[PDB]
Design an enzyme around this catalytic site. Structure first.
Site, PDB file in Angstrom:
ATOM      1  N   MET A 133      46.309 -30.880  -3.151  1.00  0.00           N
ATOM      2  CA  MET A 133      46.359 -32.330  -3.028  1.00  0.00           C
ATOM      3  C   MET A 133      46.616 -33.009  -4.375  1.00  0.00           C
ATOM      4  O   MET A 133      46.347 -32.442  -5.432  1.00  0.00           O
ATOM      5  CB  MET A 133      45.054 -32.856  -2.422  1.00  0.00           C
ATOM      6  CG  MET A 133      45.090 -34.334  -2.082  1.00  0.00           C
ATOM      7  SD  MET A 133      44.491 -35.375  -3.429  1.00  0.00           S
ATOM      8  CE  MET A 133      42.852 -34.697  -3.678  1.00  0.00           C
ATOM      9  N   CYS A 134      47.135 -34.232  -4.318  1.00  0.00           N
ATOM     10  CA  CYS A 134      47.433 -35.006  -5.519  1.00  0.00           C
ATOM     11  C   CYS A 134      47.881 -36.419  -5.140  1.00  0.00           C
ATOM     12  O   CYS A 134      47.627 -36.881  -4.030  1.00  0.00           O
ATOM     13  CB  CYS A 134      48.510 -34.304  -6.353  1.00  0.00           C
ATOM     14  SG  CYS A 134      50.198 -34.528  -5.737  1.00  0.00           S
ATOM     15  N   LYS A 135      48.551 -37.097  -6.067  1.00  0.00           N
ATOM     16  CA  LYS A 135      49.035 -38.451  -5.819  1.00  0.00           C
ATOM     17  C   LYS A 135      50.556 -38.499  -5.898  1.00  0.00           C
ATOM     18  O   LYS A 135      51.157 -37.903  -6.794  1.00  0.00           O
ATOM     19  CB  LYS A 135      48.427 -39.428  -6.829  1.00  0.00           C
ATOM     20  CG  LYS A 135      47.089 -40.003  -6.387  1.00  0.00           C
ATOM     21  CD  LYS A 135      47.238 -40.880  -5.152  1.00  0.00           C
ATOM     22  CE  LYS A 135      47.269 -42.355  -5.519  1.00  0.00           C
ATOM     23  NZ  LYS A 135      48.660 -42.876  -5.610  1.00  0.00           N
TER      24      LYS A 135
END
Ligand code: PUC
Length: 167
Positions: free
Chosen positions: A42-44
């Site tokens: 996960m990340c942005k």
């Protein structure tokens, strides 16, 4: 059993698609890339208008297994569900098509690269603008994957960033 090569749905609207997004689902049709896909959690991810009158998707991930920070520029090409963005590969060449994408619901895109080398690699990105599991998006992307011949090791659905000590 199932089949299908690929298909894009015209009538894309960047007006209600462009902007910040949350990681929810991802895929890849590469054999060498999959080896690295298993290390991207996960990340942005945010896509804003490129200074050159187009699109710019900036990725960023801090701590947890691996820290990332890059950005690509997507430029439409003819049809609405068809664009390209200089990716990594010397001459930076990439192509993306909107297989569906819904308004105010979720955004889905497939990025495939076809260059002389013969890479012919494909990818499927799922952006959540709410942070929720959508049956349509989940079913549309998961199923569409079969047509795209996704890879069980390439699929990435909002992995758990429980990576401690990886500062
Ligand atoms: C060749 C084109 C590459 C495009 C990458 C894309 O714009 C990034 C997407 C974000 C990913 C995390 C970021 C980077 C992982 C990098 C893995 C690697 O070291 O090769 C996943 C989490 O949110 C999404 C899905």
């Amino acid at each position: 059993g199932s089949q299908g090569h690929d298909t894009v749905q015209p009538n894309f609207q960047q007006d209600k698609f462009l902007g910040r997004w949350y990681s929810a689902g991802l895929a890849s049709n590469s054999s060498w890339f999959r080896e690295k896909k298993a290390v991207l959690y996960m990340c942005k991810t945010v896509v804003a208008p490129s200074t050159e009158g187009g699109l710019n998707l900036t990725s960023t991930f801090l701590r947890k297994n691996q820290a990332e920070t890059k950005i690509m520029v997507l430029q439409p090409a003819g049809a609405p569900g068809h664009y390209t963005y200089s990716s990594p590969h010397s001459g930076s060449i990439h192509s993306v098509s909107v297989v569906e994408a819904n308004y105010d619901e979720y955004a889905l895109l497939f990025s495939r690269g076809t260059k002389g080398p013969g890479q012919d690699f494909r990818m499927a990105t799922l952006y959540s603008r709410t942070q929720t599991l959508k049956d349509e998006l989940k079913e549309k992307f998961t199923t569409f994957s079969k047509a795209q011949g996704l890879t069980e090791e390439d699929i990435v659905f909002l992995p758990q960033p429980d990576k401690a000590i990886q500062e």
